[PDB]
Amino acid sequence: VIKLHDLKPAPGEKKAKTRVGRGEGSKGKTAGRGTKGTKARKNVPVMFE
RNA sequence: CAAACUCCGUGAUAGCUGGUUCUCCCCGAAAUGCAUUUAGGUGCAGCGUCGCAUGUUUCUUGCCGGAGGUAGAGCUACUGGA
Ligand SMILES: [Mg+2]
Ligand SMILES: [Mg+2]
Ligand SMILES: [Mg+2]
Ligand SMILES: [Mg+2]
Ligand SMILES: [Mg+2]
Ligand SMILES: [Mg+2]
Ligand SMILES: [Mg+2]
Ligand SMILES: [Mg+2]
Ligand SMILES: [Mg+2]
Ligand SMILES: [Mg+2]
Ligand SMILES: [Mg+2]
Ligand SMILES: [Mg+2]
Ligand SMILES: [Mg+2]
Ligand SMILES: [Mg+2]
Ligand SMILES: [Mg+2]
Ligand SMILES: [Mg+2]
């Protein structure tokens, strides 16, 4: 018997989103951008070497 | 006031400064080279990580084959110098 409550997503379909910057517990204070730098502020184009 | 004030383009633009919030488990860097209107930025390769693949090809020692050209030494051997 299938009720609307027993539905199960398949193992591995649901990968949790990565909420960058939410405490030193997981991703803290720099959001995986390292310390100061251009990538630390906005970005650099796809082109300029 | 070395270009008045209010509104608007306007979230002007900031390679600069600050800040970036709940827990645990696993691995774990560099401050190097090259290039750069580049030197406090950035990209490539090394350095980490995760996955896949080759599953030891890697490591240590012993022995073997090797080329050096340093320490030292030498100079009636040269270049110098006494
Ligand atoms: Mg900071
Ligand atoms: Mg720095
Ligand atoms: Mg950086
Ligand atoms: Mg006025
Ligand atoms: Mg407007
Ligand atoms: Mg505009
Ligand atoms: Mg602004
Ligand atoms: Mg900007
Ligand atoms: Mg500061
Ligand atoms: Mg460790
Ligand atoms: Mg083997
Ligand atoms: Mg030998
Ligand atoms: Mg020999
Ligand atoms: Mg000597
Ligand atoms: Mg002698
Ligand atoms: Mg001579």
Residue A36 CA to ligand 16 centre (angstroms): 64
Helix, coil or strand: residue A38:
helix
- Does the CB of A19 fall within 7 Å of any strand B atom? yes
CA-CA-CA-CA dihedral for A32, A35, A41, A44, to nearest 10: -80
Query: Do A27 and A17 meet the contact criterion of CB atoms below 8 Å apart?
Result: no
Q: Are A27 and A18 in contact (CB under 8 A)?
A: yes
Distance, CA of A6 to C1' of B7, in Å: 60
Reported resolution, Å = 2.5
Structure tokens at A41: 């502020």
- CA–C1' nearest nucleotide, residue A27: B20
CA A3 to CA A25: how far, in whole Å? 38
Closest CA to A33 of A49, A48, A18: A18
Measured between alpha carbons, how far is A20 from A37 in angstroms, rounded to an integer? 18
